[PDB]
Design a binder for this molecule. Structure first.
Ligand SMILES: Cc1cc(C)cc(Nc2nccc(-n3cc(CN4CC(O)C4)c(C)n3)n2)c1
Length: 271
Protein backbone atom coordinates (compact mmCIF):
# COMPACT_ATOMS: atom_id res chain seq x y z
CA UNK A 1 0.00 0.00 0.00
CA UNK A 2 2.88 2.45 0.78
CA UNK A 3 4.86 2.35 -2.46
CA UNK A 4 8.60 2.60 -3.12
CA UNK A 5 9.63 5.74 -5.07
CA UNK A 6 12.63 3.79 -6.47
CA UNK A 7 10.30 1.25 -8.17
CA UNK A 8 8.30 4.14 -9.76
CA UNK A 9 9.31 6.13 -12.83
CA UNK A 10 7.40 9.28 -13.87
CA UNK A 11 7.07 10.83 -17.31
CA UNK A 12 8.28 14.44 -17.60
CA UNK A 13 5.15 15.59 -19.49
CA UNK A 14 1.77 16.03 -17.81
CA UNK A 15 -1.44 14.19 -18.64
CA UNK A 16 -3.42 17.02 -16.99
CA UNK A 17 -3.20 19.90 -14.49
CA UNK A 18 -5.47 21.43 -11.85
CA UNK A 19 -5.68 23.13 -8.42
CA UNK A 20 -3.70 20.40 -6.58
CA UNK A 21 -0.80 20.06 -9.04
CA UNK A 22 -0.15 17.63 -11.90
CA UNK A 23 -1.21 14.23 -13.18
CA UNK A 24 1.57 12.25 -14.88
CA UNK A 25 2.04 8.98 -16.68
CA UNK A 26 4.30 6.56 -14.90
CA UNK A 27 5.48 2.98 -14.76
CA UNK A 28 5.52 1.14 -11.43
CA UNK A 29 7.66 -1.99 -11.09
CA UNK A 30 5.37 -4.54 -9.40
CA UNK A 31 6.00 -8.27 -8.66
CA UNK A 32 8.20 -8.87 -11.75
CA UNK A 33 6.25 -6.94 -14.43
CA UNK A 34 5.62 -3.23 -14.74
CA UNK A 35 2.29 -1.66 -14.59
CA UNK A 36 1.53 1.54 -16.48
CA UNK A 37 0.16 4.07 -14.00
CA UNK A 38 -1.33 7.54 -13.71
CA UNK A 39 0.02 9.53 -10.75
CA UNK A 40 -1.63 12.49 -9.00
CA UNK A 41 1.26 14.64 -7.70
CA UNK A 42 0.71 17.35 -5.13
CA UNK A 43 2.43 20.74 -5.57
CA UNK A 44 3.90 21.87 -2.24
CA UNK A 45 6.53 24.61 -2.47
CA UNK A 46 5.23 25.05 1.04
CA UNK A 47 3.93 22.20 3.14
CA UNK A 48 0.34 23.34 3.92
CA UNK A 49 -0.34 19.87 5.16
CA UNK A 50 -4.02 20.55 4.63
CA UNK A 51 -3.87 19.64 0.95
CA UNK A 52 -1.75 16.64 1.85
CA UNK A 53 -4.61 15.40 4.09
CA UNK A 54 -7.08 15.80 1.19
CA UNK A 55 -4.94 13.50 -1.01
CA UNK A 56 -4.81 10.82 1.72
CA UNK A 57 -8.59 11.12 2.16
CA UNK A 58 -9.01 10.63 -1.61
CA UNK A 59 -6.72 7.58 -1.34
CA UNK A 60 -8.69 6.39 1.74
CA UNK A 61 -11.91 6.28 -0.32
CA UNK A 62 -10.35 4.53 -3.36
CA UNK A 63 -8.72 1.98 -1.04
CA UNK A 64 -12.19 0.70 -0.05
CA UNK A 65 -13.65 0.47 -3.57
CA UNK A 66 -13.48 -2.59 -5.79
CA UNK A 67 -15.42 -2.54 -9.07
CA UNK A 68 -14.56 -3.06 -12.76
CA UNK A 69 -15.98 0.41 -13.65
CA UNK A 70 -14.07 2.36 -10.93
CA UNK A 71 -10.41 3.44 -11.25
CA UNK A 72 -8.11 1.29 -9.08
CA UNK A 73 -5.58 2.71 -6.67
CA UNK A 74 -2.22 0.89 -6.62
CA UNK A 75 -1.31 2.91 -3.53
CA UNK A 76 0.37 6.12 -2.32
CA UNK A 77 4.00 7.22 -2.28
CA UNK A 78 5.77 9.67 0.06
CA UNK A 79 8.79 11.05 -1.85
CA UNK A 80 10.00 14.46 -3.21
CA UNK A 81 6.23 15.08 -3.17
CA UNK A 82 3.05 13.27 -2.07
CA UNK A 83 1.69 10.99 -4.82
CA UNK A 84 -1.50 8.94 -5.43
CA UNK A 85 -0.70 6.09 -7.90
CA UNK A 86 -3.51 4.61 -10.01
CA UNK A 87 -4.00 2.01 -12.74
CA UNK A 88 -3.63 3.90 -16.06
CA UNK A 89 -6.70 4.33 -18.31
CA UNK A 90 -4.85 5.19 -21.50
CA UNK A 91 -7.53 6.97 -23.57
CA UNK A 92 -8.28 9.54 -20.84
CA UNK A 93 -11.37 11.71 -20.07
CA UNK A 94 -14.65 10.87 -21.88
CA UNK A 95 -15.52 14.51 -22.63
CA UNK A 96 -12.16 15.25 -24.37
CA UNK A 97 -12.29 11.97 -26.24
CA UNK A 98 -15.75 12.54 -27.64
CA UNK A 99 -14.85 16.11 -28.62
CA UNK A 100 -12.01 14.67 -30.74
CA UNK A 101 -13.83 11.53 -32.02
CA UNK A 102 -17.20 12.60 -33.49
CA UNK A 103 -17.36 9.37 -35.53
CA UNK A 104 -18.31 7.44 -32.33
CA UNK A 105 -21.78 5.81 -32.59
CA UNK A 106 -24.86 6.20 -30.34
CA UNK A 107 -24.65 2.51 -29.37
CA UNK A 108 -21.04 2.99 -28.23
CA UNK A 109 -21.93 6.03 -26.10
CA UNK A 110 -24.88 4.10 -24.59
CA UNK A 111 -22.47 1.25 -23.71
CA UNK A 112 -20.11 3.78 -22.08
CA UNK A 113 -22.75 5.56 -19.93
CA UNK A 114 -24.25 2.17 -19.01
CA UNK A 115 -20.85 1.11 -17.59
CA UNK A 116 -20.79 4.33 -15.58
CA UNK A 117 -24.32 3.58 -14.28
CA UNK A 118 -23.07 0.13 -13.22
CA UNK A 119 -20.13 1.68 -11.38
CA UNK A 120 -22.47 4.16 -9.70
CA UNK A 121 -24.94 1.38 -8.72
CA UNK A 122 -22.05 -0.23 -6.81
CA UNK A 123 -21.12 3.10 -5.19
CA UNK A 124 -24.74 3.57 -4.10
CA UNK A 125 -24.77 0.01 -2.62
CA UNK A 126 -21.48 0.83 -0.82
CA UNK A 127 -23.06 4.10 0.48
CA UNK A 128 -20.50 6.46 -0.96
CA UNK A 129 -21.52 9.74 -2.61
CA UNK A 130 -19.26 10.76 -5.48
CA UNK A 131 -20.23 14.48 -5.34
CA UNK A 132 -18.41 15.31 -8.61
CA UNK A 133 -19.98 13.03 -11.23
CA UNK A 134 -19.26 14.57 -14.65
CA UNK A 135 -17.96 13.49 -18.08
CA UNK A 136 -14.49 14.89 -17.19
CA UNK A 137 -14.25 12.29 -14.38
CA UNK A 138 -15.07 9.33 -16.61
CA UNK A 139 -11.92 7.83 -18.08
CA UNK A 140 -11.64 5.40 -21.00
CA UNK A 141 -9.49 2.26 -20.75
CA UNK A 142 -10.57 1.48 -24.32
CA UNK A 143 -13.23 2.92 -26.62
CA UNK A 144 -15.57 0.31 -25.14
CA UNK A 145 -14.51 0.39 -21.46
CA UNK A 146 -15.11 3.34 -19.11
CA UNK A 147 -14.14 3.91 -15.50
CA UNK A 148 -15.29 6.52 -12.96
CA UNK A 149 -12.43 8.66 -11.60
CA UNK A 150 -11.78 11.46 -9.10
CA UNK A 151 -12.89 10.74 -5.53
CA UNK A 152 -11.42 13.93 -4.02
CA UNK A 153 -14.92 15.10 -2.96
CA UNK A 154 -16.45 11.69 -2.15
CA UNK A 155 -17.90 10.82 1.25
CA UNK A 156 -18.77 7.59 2.99
CA UNK A 157 -22.33 8.06 4.25
CA UNK A 158 -23.22 7.69 7.93
CA UNK A 159 -25.01 4.40 8.78
CA UNK A 160 -28.15 6.29 9.95
CA UNK A 161 -28.39 8.95 7.15
CA UNK A 162 -28.76 8.63 3.38
CA UNK A 163 -27.02 12.00 2.77
CA UNK A 164 -24.01 14.21 3.54
CA UNK A 165 -24.41 17.80 4.79
CA UNK A 166 -21.64 19.93 3.24
CA UNK A 167 -20.49 23.53 3.83
CA UNK A 168 -20.51 26.55 1.41
CA UNK A 169 -19.97 26.00 -2.37
CA UNK A 170 -19.50 22.71 -9.67
CA UNK A 171 -23.02 24.17 -9.74
CA UNK A 172 -23.90 22.91 -13.18
CA UNK A 173 -23.77 19.27 -12.03
CA UNK A 174 -25.62 19.79 -8.69
CA UNK A 175 -29.20 18.79 -7.97
CA UNK A 176 -31.41 21.53 -6.39
CA UNK A 177 -31.22 20.08 -2.86
CA UNK A 178 -27.40 20.52 -3.10
CA UNK A 179 -27.75 24.19 -4.17
CA UNK A 180 -30.37 25.04 -1.53
CA UNK A 181 -29.66 22.71 1.42
CA UNK A 182 -26.12 21.35 0.75
CA UNK A 183 -27.49 17.78 0.84
CA UNK A 184 -25.55 15.18 -1.15
CA UNK A 185 -26.88 11.65 -1.69
CA UNK A 186 -26.88 8.97 -4.34
CA UNK A 187 -29.93 10.76 -5.75
CA UNK A 188 -27.88 13.95 -6.23
CA UNK A 189 -25.27 11.75 -7.98
CA UNK A 190 -28.21 10.57 -10.15
CA UNK A 191 -29.01 14.17 -11.10
CA UNK A 192 -25.33 14.62 -11.93
CA UNK A 193 -25.34 11.44 -14.06
CA UNK A 194 -28.15 13.12 -16.02
CA UNK A 195 -25.86 16.06 -16.84
CA UNK A 196 -23.10 13.53 -17.64
CA UNK A 197 -25.35 11.70 -20.12
CA UNK A 198 -26.20 15.07 -21.70
CA UNK A 199 -22.44 15.71 -21.98
CA UNK A 200 -21.81 12.28 -23.51
CA UNK A 201 -24.50 12.57 -26.20
CA UNK A 202 -23.36 16.13 -26.98
CA UNK A 203 -19.83 14.71 -27.65
CA UNK A 204 -18.26 16.60 -24.74
CA UNK A 205 -19.98 19.98 -25.00
CA UNK A 206 -20.37 22.04 -21.82
CA UNK A 207 -23.79 21.97 -20.16
CA UNK A 208 -25.74 25.23 -19.75
CA UNK A 209 -23.38 27.09 -22.16
CA UNK A 210 -22.74 30.78 -21.34
CA UNK A 211 -24.86 30.77 -18.15
CA UNK A 212 -23.89 31.77 -14.61
CA UNK A 213 -24.73 29.25 -11.87
CA UNK A 214 -27.50 31.45 -10.47
CA UNK A 215 -29.10 31.50 -13.96
CA UNK A 216 -28.88 27.70 -14.13
CA UNK A 217 -30.44 27.56 -10.64
CA UNK A 218 -33.24 29.92 -11.70
CA UNK A 219 -33.91 27.98 -14.92
CA UNK A 220 -34.27 24.71 -12.96
CA UNK A 221 -36.50 26.39 -10.33
CA UNK A 222 -39.02 27.26 -13.11
CA UNK A 223 -39.18 23.64 -14.42
CA UNK A 224 -36.85 24.10 -17.37
CA UNK A 225 -34.14 21.68 -18.46
CA UNK A 226 -31.47 21.45 -21.15
CA UNK A 227 -32.71 20.71 -24.67
CA UNK A 228 -32.11 17.47 -26.53
CA UNK A 229 -28.60 17.23 -28.01
CA UNK A 230 -28.58 17.13 -31.84
CA UNK A 231 -28.59 13.44 -32.81
CA UNK A 232 -29.26 12.08 -29.30
CA UNK A 233 -31.60 9.05 -29.11
CA UNK A 234 -35.01 10.02 -27.64
CA UNK A 235 -34.88 7.29 -25.00
CA UNK A 236 -31.61 8.66 -23.59
CA UNK A 237 -32.98 12.18 -23.51
CA UNK A 238 -36.07 10.85 -21.66
CA UNK A 239 -33.72 9.19 -19.14
CA UNK A 240 -31.87 12.52 -18.62
CA UNK A 241 -35.15 14.24 -17.72
CA UNK A 242 -36.05 11.46 -15.25
CA UNK A 243 -32.59 11.94 -13.66
CA UNK A 244 -33.47 15.68 -13.41
CA UNK A 245 -36.63 15.02 -11.32
CA UNK A 246 -36.79 18.01 -8.89
CA UNK A 247 -38.14 15.98 -5.97
CA UNK A 248 -35.41 13.81 -4.39
CA UNK A 249 -37.78 10.96 -3.39
CA UNK A 250 -39.48 10.54 -6.77
CA UNK A 251 -36.10 10.79 -8.56
CA UNK A 252 -34.83 7.28 -9.37
CA UNK A 253 -31.82 5.66 -7.77
CA UNK A 254 -28.97 4.04 -9.70
CA UNK A 255 -30.54 0.55 -9.58
CA UNK A 256 -33.49 1.75 -11.65
CA UNK A 257 -31.31 4.01 -13.83
CA UNK A 258 -28.92 1.10 -14.60
CA UNK A 259 -31.79 -1.24 -15.53
CA UNK A 260 -33.29 1.31 -17.89
CA UNK A 261 -29.87 1.62 -19.50
CA UNK A 262 -29.50 -2.21 -19.91
CA UNK A 263 -32.80 -2.55 -21.72
CA UNK A 264 -32.23 0.33 -24.16
CA UNK A 265 -28.67 -0.90 -24.92
CA UNK A 266 -30.00 -4.36 -25.84
CA UNK A 267 -32.77 -2.64 -27.87
CA UNK A 268 -30.16 -0.64 -29.81
CA UNK A 269 -28.04 -3.85 -30.20
CA UNK A 270 -31.22 -5.72 -31.36
CA UNK A 271 -32.73 -3.10 -33.74
C1 LIG B 1 -4.46 10.36 -21.81
C2 LIG B 1 -4.93 10.68 -20.39
C3 LIG B 1 -5.03 12.00 -19.94
C4 LIG B 1 -5.47 12.25 -18.64
C5 LIG B 1 -5.59 13.69 -18.09
C6 LIG B 1 -5.79 11.20 -17.79
C7 LIG B 1 -5.61 9.88 -18.22
N1 LIG B 1 -6.03 8.83 -17.51
C8 LIG B 1 -5.90 8.37 -16.27
N2 LIG B 1 -5.81 7.07 -15.95
C9 LIG B 1 -5.84 6.71 -14.66
C10 LIG B 1 -6.08 7.65 -13.64
C11 LIG B 1 -6.24 8.98 -14.03
N3 LIG B 1 -6.52 10.04 -13.27
C12 LIG B 1 -6.63 11.29 -13.74
C13 LIG B 1 -6.96 12.09 -12.74
C14 LIG B 1 -7.24 13.61 -12.82
N4 LIG B 1 -8.60 13.58 -13.35
C15 LIG B 1 -8.90 13.59 -14.78
C16 LIG B 1 -10.14 14.39 -14.47
O1 LIG B 1 -10.28 15.31 -15.53
C17 LIG B 1 -9.24 14.93 -13.35
C18 LIG B 1 -7.08 11.22 -11.66
C19 LIG B 1 -7.45 11.61 -10.24
N5 LIG B 1 -6.81 9.99 -12.06
N6 LIG B 1 -6.20 9.25 -15.33
C20 LIG B 1 -5.25 9.63 -19.54
Amino acid sequence: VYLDRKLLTLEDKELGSGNFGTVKKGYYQMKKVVKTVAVKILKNEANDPALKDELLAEANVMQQLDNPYIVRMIGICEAESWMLVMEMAELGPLNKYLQQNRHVKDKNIIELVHQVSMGMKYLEESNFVHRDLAARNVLLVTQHYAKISDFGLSKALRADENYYKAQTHPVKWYAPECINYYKFSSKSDVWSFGVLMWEAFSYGQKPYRGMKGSEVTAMLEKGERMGCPAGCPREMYDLMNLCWTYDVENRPGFAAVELRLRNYYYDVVNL
